[PDB]
Amino acid sequence: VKNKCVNFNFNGLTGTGVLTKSNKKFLPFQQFGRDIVDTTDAVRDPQT
Amino acid sequence: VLHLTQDLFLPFFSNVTWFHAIDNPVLPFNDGVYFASTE
Ligand SMILES: *[C@@H]1O[C@H](CO)[C@@H](O)[C@H](O)[C@H]1NC(C)=O
Ligand SMILES: *[C@@H]1O[C@H](CO)[C@@H](O)[C@H](O)[C@H]1NC(C)=O
């Protein structure tokens, strides 16, 4: 479910937020995302 | 971002030995080794 605040458990990375499509350029080895504040910003869906 | 990491890296301007081939000596392995080859 996108554009709706929902608790997520993506591969054991529990949390809460809003999911959406991204234009980012994740490399094949990439799984996680972050920022200079070292907090998870984007995740790659294991099943899609 | 300018993420700073600490890990086993090959030093910059470090000293590397160049080998030829024409017998396959065994070289020590310690904290990782770096391998390069153009063929
Ligand atoms: C997950 O499994 C289903 C059924 O086996 C399959 O249709 C789907 O493509 C799989 N997803 C990935 C990312 O491989
Ligand atoms: C690599 O070896 C040469 C000759 O043995 C030496 O002069 C040089 O200082 C070495 N490299 C470094 C980075 O010390």
UniProtKB/Swiss-Prot annotation, chain B:
- Gene encoding this polypeptide? S
Superkingdom of origin organism: Viruses
What's the source species for this entry? Severe acute respiratory syndrome coronavirus 2
Residue window of the full protein shown: 47 to 96 of 1273
High-level lineage: Viruses, Riboviria, Orthornavirae, Pisuviricota, Pisoniviricetes
Effect seen on changing Q6H: In strain: Omicron/EG.5.1
Q: What role does this protein play?
A: Attaches the virion to the cell membrane by interacting with host receptor, initiating the infection. The major receptor is host ACE2. When S2/S2' has been cleaved, binding to the receptor triggers direct fusion at the cell membrane. When S2/S2' has not been cleaved, binding to the receptor results in internalization of the virus by endocytosis using host TFRC and GRM2 and leading to fusion of the virion membrane with the host endosomal membrane. Alternatively, may use NRP1/NRP2 and integrin as entry receptors.
| Stated name of the protein | Spike protein S1
Query: Would you list which residues are glycosylated?
Result: N15
Name the consequence of D23A: In strain: Beta/B.1.351
Assembly and partners are described as: Binds to host ACE2. RBD also interacts with the N-linked glycan on 'Asn-90' of ACE2. Cleavage of S generates a polybasic C-terminal sequence on S1 that binds to host Neuropilin-1 (NRP1) and Neuropilin-2 (NRP2) receptors. Interacts with host integrin alpha-5/beta-1 (ITGA5:ITGB1) and with ACE2 in complex with integrin alpha-5/beta-1 (ITGA5:ITGB1). May interact via cytoplasmic c-terminus with M protein. May interact (via N-terminus) with host bilirubin and biliverdin, thereby preventing antibody binding to the SARS-CoV-2 spike NTD via an allosteric mechanism.
